RNA sequence: ACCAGGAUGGCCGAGUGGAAGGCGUUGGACUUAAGAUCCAAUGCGUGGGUUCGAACCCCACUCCUGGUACCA
Protein backbone atom coordinates (compact mmCIF):
# COMPACT_ATOMS: atom_id res chain seq x y z
CA UNK A 1 0.00 0.00 0.00
CA UNK A 2 2.85 2.38 -0.81
CA UNK A 3 0.57 4.49 -3.02
CA UNK A 4 -2.16 4.49 -0.36
CA UNK A 5 0.37 5.44 2.32
CA UNK A 6 1.67 8.25 0.10
CA UNK A 7 -1.84 9.62 -0.40
CA UNK A 8 -2.52 9.36 3.34
CA UNK A 9 0.67 11.23 4.21
CA UNK A 10 -0.09 13.97 1.71
CA UNK A 11 -3.59 14.22 3.19
CA UNK A 12 -2.26 14.52 6.74
CA UNK A 13 0.26 17.18 5.76
CA UNK A 14 -2.45 19.12 3.92
CA UNK A 15 -4.73 18.94 6.96
CA UNK A 16 -1.94 20.21 9.20
CA UNK A 17 -1.39 23.04 6.73
CA UNK A 18 -5.11 23.85 6.82
CA UNK A 19 -5.11 23.94 10.62
CA UNK A 20 -2.11 26.28 10.70
CA UNK A 21 -3.64 28.43 7.96
CA UNK A 22 -6.90 28.82 9.86
CA UNK A 23 -4.92 29.80 12.95
CA UNK A 24 -3.07 32.43 10.93
CA UNK A 25 -6.34 33.63 9.39
CA UNK A 26 -7.76 34.20 12.87
CA UNK A 27 -4.58 35.99 13.95
CA UNK A 28 -4.75 38.33 10.95
CA UNK A 29 -8.46 38.87 11.61
CA UNK A 30 -7.71 40.01 15.15
CA UNK A 31 -4.89 42.24 13.90
CA UNK A 32 -7.30 43.87 11.43
CA UNK A 33 -9.99 44.40 14.06
CA UNK A 34 -7.35 45.93 16.37
CA UNK A 35 -6.13 48.27 13.62
CA UNK A 36 -6.15 52.00 14.39
CA UNK A 37 -5.02 53.42 11.03
CA UNK A 38 -6.21 52.97 7.46
CA UNK A 39 -2.79 51.68 6.40
CA UNK A 40 -2.94 49.01 9.11
CA UNK A 41 -6.45 48.06 8.00
CA UNK A 42 -5.40 47.70 4.36
CA UNK A 43 -2.19 45.79 5.11
CA UNK A 44 -3.97 43.35 7.43
CA UNK A 45 -6.73 42.99 4.83
CA UNK A 46 -4.15 42.10 2.19
CA UNK A 47 -2.50 39.57 4.51
CA UNK A 48 -5.92 38.05 5.21
CA UNK A 49 -6.55 37.93 1.45
CA UNK A 50 -3.28 36.07 0.88
CA UNK A 51 -3.95 33.61 3.70
CA UNK A 52 -7.50 32.92 2.54
CA UNK A 53 -6.24 32.38 -1.02
CA UNK A 54 -3.82 29.79 0.37
CA UNK A 55 -6.74 28.23 2.24
CA UNK A 56 -8.77 28.23 -0.98
CA UNK A 57 -6.01 26.33 -2.78
CA UNK A 58 -5.89 23.81 0.07
CA UNK A 59 -9.68 23.50 -0.14
CA UNK A 60 -9.53 22.86 -3.89
CA UNK A 61 -7.13 20.03 -3.09
CA UNK A 62 -9.47 18.77 -0.35
CA UNK A 63 -12.45 18.80 -2.72
CA UNK A 64 -10.47 16.86 -5.32
CA UNK A 65 -9.49 14.31 -2.66
CA UNK A 66 -13.01 13.83 -1.27
CA UNK A 67 -14.14 13.43 -4.88
CA UNK A 68 -11.85 10.39 -5.11
CA UNK A 69 -12.85 6.86 -4.14
CA UNK A 70 -9.44 6.00 -2.67
CA UNK A 71 -10.41 7.45 0.72
CA UNK A 72 -13.18 5.64 2.61
CA UNK A 73 -13.63 7.48 5.94
CA UNK A 74 -13.27 11.11 4.85
CA UNK A 75 -15.01 12.72 7.82
CA UNK A 76 -11.85 14.65 8.69
CA UNK A 77 -11.60 15.96 5.12
CA UNK A 78 -15.26 17.02 5.25
CA UNK A 79 -14.76 18.83 8.56
CA UNK A 80 -11.66 20.64 7.29
CA UNK A 81 -13.50 21.66 4.11
CA UNK A 82 -16.33 23.02 6.27
CA UNK A 83 -13.81 24.97 8.35
CA UNK A 84 -12.13 26.43 5.26
CA UNK A 85 -15.50 27.47 3.84
CA UNK A 86 -16.40 29.10 7.16
CA UNK A 87 -13.17 31.11 6.99
CA UNK A 88 -13.89 32.03 3.37
CA UNK A 89 -17.38 33.26 4.25
CA UNK A 90 -15.96 35.31 7.12
CA UNK A 91 -13.38 36.88 4.80
CA UNK A 92 -16.05 37.62 2.19
CA UNK A 93 -18.16 39.37 4.84
CA UNK A 94 -15.12 41.35 6.01
CA UNK A 95 -14.17 42.39 2.48
CA UNK A 96 -17.72 43.37 1.51
CA UNK A 97 -18.05 45.44 4.68
CA UNK A 98 -14.73 47.23 4.17
CA UNK A 99 -14.82 47.78 0.39
CA UNK A 100 -18.26 49.41 0.41
CA UNK A 101 -18.10 53.14 -0.27
CA UNK A 102 -20.03 55.40 2.07
CA UNK A 103 -21.93 57.29 -0.64
CA UNK A 104 -22.04 54.64 -3.36
CA UNK A 105 -25.39 53.11 -4.30
CA UNK A 106 -24.97 50.18 -1.91
CA UNK A 107 -23.55 52.41 0.83
CA UNK A 108 -26.38 54.95 0.74
CA UNK A 109 -28.85 52.67 2.54
CA UNK A 110 -26.65 50.69 4.93
CA UNK A 111 -29.25 51.42 7.65
CA UNK A 112 -28.17 50.76 11.26
CA UNK A 113 -24.55 49.84 10.55
CA UNK A 114 -23.62 50.62 14.15
CA UNK A 115 -21.88 48.44 16.70
CA UNK A 116 -24.39 46.06 18.35
CA UNK A 117 -23.37 47.57 21.68
CA UNK A 118 -24.33 50.98 20.28
CA UNK A 119 -27.68 49.67 19.03
CA UNK A 120 -28.46 48.11 22.41
CA UNK A 121 -27.39 51.31 24.18
CA UNK A 122 -29.75 53.33 21.98
CA UNK A 123 -32.58 50.87 22.63
CA UNK A 124 -32.04 51.03 26.40
CA UNK A 125 -31.92 54.83 26.34
CA UNK A 126 -35.11 54.96 24.28
CA UNK A 127 -36.87 52.63 26.72
CA UNK A 128 -35.72 54.76 29.65
CA UNK A 129 -37.02 57.90 27.96
CA UNK A 130 -40.38 56.24 27.26
CA UNK A 131 -40.59 55.15 30.90
CA UNK A 132 -39.83 58.74 31.91
CA UNK A 133 -42.65 59.96 29.67
CA UNK A 134 -45.07 57.45 31.20
CA UNK A 135 -44.02 58.41 34.73
CA UNK A 136 -44.46 62.11 33.92
CA UNK A 137 -47.95 61.41 32.55
CA UNK A 138 -48.80 59.51 35.74
CA UNK A 139 -47.44 62.37 37.85
CA UNK A 140 -49.54 64.90 35.94
CA UNK A 141 -52.66 62.75 36.34
CA UNK A 142 -52.00 62.29 40.06
CA UNK A 143 -51.40 66.00 40.64
CA UNK A 144 -54.57 66.92 38.74
CA UNK A 145 -56.58 64.42 40.78
CA UNK A 146 -54.97 65.72 43.98
CA UNK A 147 -56.07 69.25 43.11
CA UNK A 148 -59.56 67.96 42.29
CA UNK A 149 -59.82 66.14 45.62
CA UNK A 150 -58.48 69.14 47.54
CA UNK A 151 -61.13 71.31 45.86
CA UNK A 152 -63.80 68.75 46.72
CA UNK A 153 -62.68 68.58 50.36
CA UNK A 154 -62.65 72.38 50.59
CA UNK A 155 -66.17 72.59 49.16
CA UNK A 156 -67.48 69.78 51.39
CA UNK A 157 -65.30 70.53 54.44
CA UNK A 158 -65.00 66.81 55.20
CA UNK A 159 -64.61 63.35 53.63
CA UNK A 160 -61.61 62.26 55.68
CA UNK A 161 -61.19 59.29 53.35
CA UNK A 162 -60.45 61.89 50.67
CA UNK A 163 -57.69 63.36 52.85
CA UNK A 164 -56.24 59.87 53.27
CA UNK A 165 -56.37 59.30 49.51
CA UNK A 166 -54.75 62.70 48.91
CA UNK A 167 -51.87 61.74 51.21
CA UNK A 168 -51.62 58.44 49.34
CA UNK A 169 -51.49 60.30 46.03
CA UNK A 170 -48.82 62.61 47.46
CA UNK A 171 -46.68 59.60 48.34
CA UNK A 172 -47.36 58.06 44.92
CA UNK A 173 -46.21 61.25 43.20
CA UNK A 174 -43.13 61.31 45.44
CA UNK A 175 -42.23 57.79 44.33
CA UNK A 176 -42.98 58.55 40.67
CA UNK A 177 -40.66 61.57 40.80
CA UNK A 178 -38.00 59.49 42.55
CA UNK A 179 -38.25 56.88 39.78
CA UNK A 180 -38.04 59.60 37.12
CA UNK A 181 -34.95 61.18 38.68
CA UNK A 182 -33.26 57.79 39.03
CA UNK A 183 -34.05 57.08 35.37
CA UNK A 184 -32.56 60.45 34.41
CA UNK A 185 -29.40 59.65 36.37
CA UNK A 186 -29.18 56.22 34.72
CA UNK A 187 -29.60 57.68 31.23
CA UNK A 188 -27.06 60.44 31.86
CA UNK A 189 -24.56 57.84 33.07
CA UNK A 190 -25.29 55.64 30.05
CA UNK A 191 -24.71 58.47 27.58
CA UNK A 192 -21.22 59.09 29.00
CA UNK A 193 -20.53 55.32 28.92
CA UNK A 194 -20.49 55.11 32.72
CA UNK A 195 -23.06 52.32 33.24
CA UNK A 196 -23.51 48.88 31.70
CA UNK A 197 -26.52 47.84 29.66
CA UNK A 198 -26.75 44.60 31.64
CA UNK A 199 -26.96 46.66 34.83
CA UNK A 200 -29.94 48.54 33.38
CA UNK A 201 -31.58 45.30 32.22
CA UNK A 202 -31.20 43.78 35.70
CA UNK A 203 -33.66 46.43 36.97
CA UNK A 204 -35.68 46.78 33.75
CA UNK A 205 -38.12 44.10 34.90
CA UNK A 206 -38.59 45.72 38.32
CA UNK A 207 -39.14 49.16 36.76
CA UNK A 208 -41.75 47.65 34.45
CA UNK A 209 -43.37 45.94 37.44
CA UNK A 210 -43.58 49.25 39.31
CA UNK A 211 -44.94 51.25 36.38
CA UNK A 212 -47.54 48.55 35.70
CA UNK A 213 -49.05 48.74 39.21
CA UNK A 214 -47.88 51.03 42.03
CA UNK A 215 -51.01 52.55 43.63
CA UNK A 216 -52.92 49.30 44.12
CA UNK A 217 -53.06 48.09 47.75
CA UNK A 218 -51.39 44.77 46.86
CA UNK A 219 -48.18 46.55 45.88
CA UNK A 220 -44.98 44.71 46.84
CA UNK A 221 -42.52 47.59 46.58
CA UNK A 222 -38.94 46.30 46.48
CA UNK A 223 -36.84 48.97 48.19
CA UNK A 224 -33.73 47.23 46.82
CA UNK A 225 -34.38 48.36 43.24
CA UNK A 226 -31.67 51.03 42.89
CA UNK A 227 -29.67 49.78 45.89
CA UNK A 228 -27.68 47.22 43.90
CA UNK A 229 -26.25 50.03 41.75
CA UNK A 230 -24.37 52.77 43.63
CA UNK A 231 -26.08 55.60 41.76
C1' A B 1 -1.13 9.30 -28.17
C1' C B 2 -2.37 7.75 -22.46
C1' C B 3 -3.36 10.34 -17.56
C1' A B 4 -4.51 14.98 -14.84
C1' G B 5 -6.02 20.26 -14.51
C1' G B 6 -7.75 24.45 -16.41
C1' A B 7 -10.86 28.32 -20.04
C1' U B 8 -15.38 34.07 -15.90
C1' G B 9 -14.86 41.73 -16.69
C1' G B 10 -10.39 45.12 -21.29
C1' C B 11 -5.42 42.10 -18.35
C1' C B 12 -4.56 39.20 -13.96
C1' G B 13 -8.22 36.50 -11.27
C1' A B 14 -11.90 34.38 -6.35
C1' G B 15 -16.25 31.80 -6.65
C1' U B 16 -19.81 26.05 -3.20
C1' G B 17 -26.51 25.07 -6.17
C1' G B 18 -30.49 30.56 -4.10
C1' A B 19 -20.72 37.65 -11.55
C1' A B 20 -16.90 39.11 -6.51
C1' G B 21 -11.56 41.60 -5.89
C1' G B 22 -6.72 43.98 -7.83
C1' C B 23 -5.08 46.51 -12.16
C1' G B 24 -7.53 49.00 -15.88
C1' U B 25 -11.72 52.25 -18.39
C1' U B 26 -15.24 56.72 -17.62
C1' G B 27 -17.46 61.20 -14.71
C1' G B 28 -16.43 64.90 -10.95
C1' A B 29 -12.85 67.20 -6.99
C1' C B 30 -8.06 68.74 -5.81
C1' U B 31 -3.42 71.71 -8.88
C1' U B 32 -1.76 76.61 -13.65
C1' A B 33 -1.39 71.55 -15.64
C1' A B 34 0.04 66.28 -15.40
C1' G B 35 1.18 62.58 -11.79
C1' A B 36 0.10 61.22 -6.80
C1' U B 37 -4.41 61.77 -3.72
C1' C B 38 -10.11 62.22 -2.88
C1' C B 39 -15.74 61.16 -4.23
C1' A B 40 -18.14 58.07 -7.66
C1' A B 41 -19.92 54.72 -12.31
C1' U B 42 -19.53 50.43 -16.22
C1' G B 43 -17.44 45.83 -17.16
C1' C B 44 -19.28 32.24 -16.53
C1' G B 45 -15.08 28.76 -23.77
C1' U B 46 -19.49 25.60 -26.12
C1' G B 47 -24.16 22.63 -26.28
C1' G B 48 -26.98 18.82 -23.76
C1' G B 49 -28.54 16.32 -18.73
C1' U B 50 -30.48 16.29 -13.04
C1' U B 51 -32.49 20.26 -10.21
C1' C B 52 -38.04 24.49 -8.36
C1' G B 53 -33.33 26.99 -10.08
C1' A B 54 -26.77 25.10 -11.86
C1' A B 55 -21.16 30.07 -13.15
C1' C B 56 -21.23 25.73 -9.47
C1' C B 57 -22.99 18.74 -9.99
C1' C B 58 -23.03 14.90 -14.64
C1' C B 59 -22.40 13.76 -20.42
C1' A B 60 -20.27 15.40 -24.79
C1' C B 61 -17.33 19.28 -28.08
C1' U B 62 -13.10 23.32 -29.02
C1' C B 63 -8.38 25.97 -26.97
C1' C B 64 -4.41 25.58 -23.61
C1' U B 65 -1.38 23.76 -19.79
C1' G B 66 1.39 19.82 -16.71
C1' G B 67 3.58 14.50 -16.44
C1' U B 68 4.80 9.86 -19.21
C1' A B 69 6.19 7.50 -23.68
C1' C B 70 11.04 2.33 -20.74
C1' C B 71 13.90 -3.10 -21.89
C1' A B 72 15.81 -4.74 -25.74
CA angle A83, A44, A115 (to 5 degrees): 80
A42 touches strand B (CB under 7 A): no
Q: Counting Cβ atoms within 10 Å, is residue A131 exposed (0-12), middle (13-18) or buried (19+)? A: buried
Bases of chain B with protein Cβ within 7 A: 5, 14-16, 20-22, 39-42, 58
A56, A43 Cβ separation under 8 angstroms: no
Q: Which of these, A190, A170, A167, lies nearest to A178 by C-alpha position?
A: A170
Q: Where are the domains of chain A?
A: 2-108, 116-212
A64 touches strand B (CB under 7 A): yes
| DSSP summary character for residue A219 | -
In angstroms, this model's resolution equals 3.1
Render the burial of A72-110: b for 16+ CB within 10 Å, e for the rest.
eebeebeebbebbeebbeebeebeeeeeeeeeeeeeeee
Q: Which of these, A178, A167, A185, A182, lies nearest to A138 by C-alpha position?
A: A178
d(CA A76, CA A8) in angstroms, rounded, equals 12
Amino acid sequence: MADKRKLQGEIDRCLKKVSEGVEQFEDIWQKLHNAANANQKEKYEADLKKEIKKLQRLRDQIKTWVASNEIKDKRQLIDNRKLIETQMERFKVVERETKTKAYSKEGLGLAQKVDPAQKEKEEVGQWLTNTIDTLNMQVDQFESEVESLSVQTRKKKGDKDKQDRIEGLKRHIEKHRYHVRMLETILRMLDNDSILVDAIRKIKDDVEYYVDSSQDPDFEENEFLYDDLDL
